[PDB]
Amino acid sequence: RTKVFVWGLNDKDQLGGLKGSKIKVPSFSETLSALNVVQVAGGSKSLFAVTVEGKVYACGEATNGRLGLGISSGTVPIPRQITALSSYVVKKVAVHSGGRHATALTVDGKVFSWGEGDDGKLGHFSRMNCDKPRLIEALKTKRIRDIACGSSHSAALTSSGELYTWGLGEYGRLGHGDNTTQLKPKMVKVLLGHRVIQVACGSRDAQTLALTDEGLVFSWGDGDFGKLGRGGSEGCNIPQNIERLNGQGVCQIECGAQFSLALTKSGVVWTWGKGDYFRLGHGSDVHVRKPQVVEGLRGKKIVHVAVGALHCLAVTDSGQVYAWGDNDHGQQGNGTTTVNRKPTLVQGLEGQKITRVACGSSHSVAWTT
């Protein structure tokens, strides 16, 4: 039994069956609460749920085959199972908040991809769209442990700790020492000798973040607005260590629209990048070019975080969700369309031990377990 709550933009029914288009208060999801979810994940006006059984459901805008349901034009208003993956136990779906493609990882380590095919982000040696999940052949002999997708590139890491990237090469977000597009997965050779345990991918002129099992965070790709975390705006196509975060116990990394976020094991949140519309959480909309602690959450032990395009969710260990950032479509959950300049307690979730959050482009999810 897992209760799932959604709010935010609903113009394409990306919330799985609620009336209205601006759900400004977290609303109980009948359909999603029924599935017994282990993960929810938001793309561009899209929503995916991975269930304990290992099945995947999808709803929202269907364009570019982003939902993987064998179509490419409508909206899918009620969460629908991705039958193409029904012979597999899926463990995780990786999709970006500004994303029109996704990947799914099985428990036995296989990676499928579907959706928009531009720049090779599906990893199939082509730029073709896949309306239905397709096995990434390049990785069949690799035991994949984690996956991520930006808007224009993808990543996957092995149980032994090697990171793979593929997709758009422009602005060096792939990390291979050049700006070349890769239509198949390619190993980030610079990071060999570090066991990479987590990776996160940005959108548009995108950054990439990696996390090693020693707590070192690396970044590379586009440098606009200081989302690389080393000051100024210079980009690089080779992973560099974000020195500010060493020794801090970073256990989760995320990439929204043009900014970066890190959570530590002690419960601290750091953000940096493009500040417009208050997506960083520091109470002003200025850019932050090296990681800064979200002060508005001192003393609250955050246990899970999620980012959308312009908003963030943080979950405390007592089951409270804090939101900050833009609110054009209600994705803050403060009952209005007013921006949350600071971390702001989310409304309508009392009596709920919320454990996990997720974000799409303009929508929000919180569930229990």
Partner: peptide
């Protein structure tokens, strides 16, 4: 903004 969705409803 390039990342602000629009409400097509």
């Amino acid at each position: 903004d390039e990342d602000k969705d629009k409400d097509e409803t």
